Design a protein that fits this description.
Six copies of one chain form a homohexamer. Chain A has two domains: about 100 residues, Alpha-Beta Plaits (2-Layer Sandwich); about 100 residues, 2-Layer Sandwich (Alpha-Beta Plaits). Helix content of chain A is about 35%, strand content about 25%. Chain A is built from six helices and eight strands, in the order E-H-E-H-E-E-H-E-H-E-H-E-E-H. In chain A, about 60% of the residues are buried. Chains B, C, D: Homotrimer. Forms a dimer of stacked trimers, the same faces interact. A CsoS1-CsoS1D-CsoS2 complex can be isolated following expression in E.coli. Chains B, C, D: GO terms for molecular function: structural constituent of carboxysome shell. Chains B, C, D: This is Carboxysome shell protein CsoS1D.
Chain lengths: ~200, ~200, ~200, ~200, ~200, ~200
């Protein structure tokens, strides 16, 4: 069982936790809670991995995707120590470490300004779990592989600017991140999302 | 016949605010509105008697059918257009046909209104997983709620409240037994949006 | 007990027409009907008292449970079978058990009926995005609508109207507070299907 | 104001049984319960007046908001916690705020109750395709049903019935006009779970 | 940004516009309106492409699919000129033309007659946005790559016969088209759908 | 048209038929009925295959998946003869036989015991059409290719033990099977599911 992804979030920002509070089909997150995202292979082995992590401590399970190529899942708990413990118990159980993860890589990233009404409606109707985007409101879009690392980009984005979380897809082969706001805030938050990706790209 | 067609709601909006415009475009089944467009909501009973009210409003104007839906018992629609005179003209014709006027409407009966300060984390994430088509709500954030009946009247309070303060539209359900309007933001910011919503319903009685 | 079991609807169809057969198979949760099959719709209250009515109809016949569902307040079912005598036999047994007969049913109260000629383009596409399980409607096309109560009675008008003219079944919702029946086609073709639907409900009073 | 807030349901469960615990976690929109956790269901009207009842229960205790939802007309919630005293403490505070007590609740009016032995194959598979969030039902299997009002009271009968016998929870819908509770198992096993459910509702009158 | 698909429809036939009026998660079509379908790569670049097209003229946005392999979208407007202008502004913005599109190709096509009741129900229940098919009613099925060109086949089909639009999948790597009616109308409409595909296959 | 999968079930066990009674978007199964699952290629050819099978006898159609890689479908009828006849009429129509099917192969299989509450909720909420799993309840998970053969494993599992059917995914490139119960019943049913797979692996 190899480690394809591994991303720890010190503290879920307000809008970040609120978003994953919507999508999560299990235990719900809260602002301040630590989070642990992990993809592995085979994907069916994520059931065994879910058992171990929950057996290790008081961590809770929020998400659990199970494909054949790989399986993802997220853990929540206010205390960073509790979540990090279960995380290191899973790796020490599958002969793996944090750096054995697959290095992230950006494939697309841009800032479209003054979005039109029509564009905003399709952004708001097609599988959106974030907030509403308005016309005249810029937007930052990002794609990454492995997909999990998009969460790291979203947490630093809000932590470093006043923008609006519109959507955060972290499940699958690739990921997606949509933000919005005045061009100033969106460009300062966009450069912060990519900077967060460059940190993992240097391990 | 055309006399048994009750007129639950009849609200007009001179100009759709940004948030309420993008929200309507998200939850509507008709043609999406463009921010600043005039609107004309209308609810009636029997539920599917809105088919004649729609046919008349469209035949008699250049307005687009922004919304049409037949609730369990009732049925509502919404007409959009940039020209105010165009929207209102549609309403004039439909009123002449069914034999009615503006003041023959079911006046807004506010069934609930309050403001909860510092919404707990649990309370917040719960509202987010509530078939939410608007924006998210956050913990520590103050919230304002306004239930009414008919449901189509909270559309007016949602608009004039947004004009008054830069709040966050969580959900504006104007179709159903009751119309529920939920906002959010900072305590002071929400107390201003709330007052604006009170007069919206109170200036119709 | 078995006496408090109201009998909202009790309609029988000698033979399911093509369009109404494929439509029922699309929206039903039971075994799909084959065109030409006999049907027996039954609505009751309390909502989930239909469990005993179903158990009896199946135990006492070779009929298949084509539909069973418990609406918010009410609950309906549908029995299918090629043999007419088989379907009717099920109904005979269930009536003996609950202590009732054919004429102890809630007679159809038509709450709305009309025909709109040349449906505008906006009005048409709107009806298409209305949780539509039937066929599409087109602009310029004429439409006929028939709301009633109980809802299970528009199933009879939908069938006999289809027999009368080659129209287009948009939606036949027989479950709910009200039963809504929507057709379409050419003006003259729809005026014939409409008349047939009027007598379907009027020959039950 | 706080006086117009009707108290439809007010049930407490000392300990959530296995099946009813995993089921609640499946259909709830809040924080999932852990088997053995105390619960406190509460329904009110107007529908979205549950926002103040929730805010108070959470502010005044360490309980998690297991559920919150605004039905068409009503609105319910559920508080979970391992400590019984913690859950009950939340209820004490909310009662003091709205000006009410335990015995000012809308007593359970059982609208339907029965037991169907040897459920036919058609009847079974039909219940399975009924927006089912619980376990499956099988043919030949005996079933027990219990509809009531308010709907939030079948949560008590579902728990004490599960304690009495090792049955199968099909569906426990506590939100809506009516509360429907469906079980299953062997004839004798179900007749014991049924009796336990009768006293659950009858010891509240 | 390469052009994978490009298909302009002179005038949406009655049943065609009615179908895309249902599926579209944005602005709705109308009989007579012109339509412009376009797939490109990367798929995330379709957001930038949506911005440009809507900025070019009074065209409206009806659909917008966004994958990683490629991104699709549809534009509507009564006037053919308005839609064609925005279309040529997008290509001149991404260094591309109409003929640089990927040539269509059929992988499957047949006419099954006298469909059975059971078959019709699964056709009507499994993700159908068209009209109902009846038993005793023939059926034409078609598959194409790129997927977008299936719209060109559907528009000519109804324009050349009296059949029934049952479904039209144009999003993804491949497309699908289901028709129905008396064998005569379905075979005359089927040969017209394939003929429309052969026109693009000769560019 | 090649045969990718072929699996005949003598008699749908109680919980098996009850499960496929939920998922099937067509005619519904019943305990005792025989079932016939078949995947082929191209997937669009499954429409032609559906027509033939239903034309051959009184068999009914319950499922019909139609991809491009391959198309699946299931047939139901109390009498084993009726279902087997239509099955052999389809193969004799596409120049194929039972043994020309693709041999099954296991990629994953384990028994996790004493599942935790959090794990059970995500198992119960994420696309489950079976029954509820409880905490303290073991679980058997299996994956197979071709996907169709998972049904053969589920039928023998219940037929050979007292467990709980939680989910049975048989559509797609691969399949999945989730069971639960006391470790004793789950391990005796797990060894029976794999044994059923080994029978087809020896043809």
């Amino acid at each position: 069982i190899e480690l394809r992804t591994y991303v720890f979030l010190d503290s879920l920002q307000p809008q970040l936790a609120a978003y994953m509070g919507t999508v999560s089909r299990g235990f719900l997150p809260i602002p301040g809670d630590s989070c642990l995202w992990m993809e592995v292979s085979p994907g069916m082995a994520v059931h065994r991995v879910t058992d171990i992590a929950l057996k290790a401590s008081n961590v809770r399970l929020g998400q659990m995707i199970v494909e054949r190529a790989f399986g993802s899942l997220a853990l929540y708990h206010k205390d960073q120590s509790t979540v990090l413990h279960s995380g290191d118990v899973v790796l020490d159980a599958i002969g793996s470490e944090v750096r054995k993860r697959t290095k992230p890589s950006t494939s697309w990233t841009e800032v479209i300004c003054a979005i039109t009404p029509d564009h905003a409606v399709l952004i708001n109707r097609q599988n959106r779990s974030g907030s509403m985007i308005q016309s005249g409101m810029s937007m930052f879009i990002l794609e990454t592989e492995p997909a999990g690392y998009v969460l790291k980009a979203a947490n630093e984005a809000e932590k470093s600017a006043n923008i609006t979380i519109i959507d955060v897809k972290a499940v699958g082969a690739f990921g997606r991140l949509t933000l919005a706001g005045k061009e100033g805030d969106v460009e300062e938050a966009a450069a912060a999302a990519i900077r967060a990706i460059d940190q993992i790209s240097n391990y």
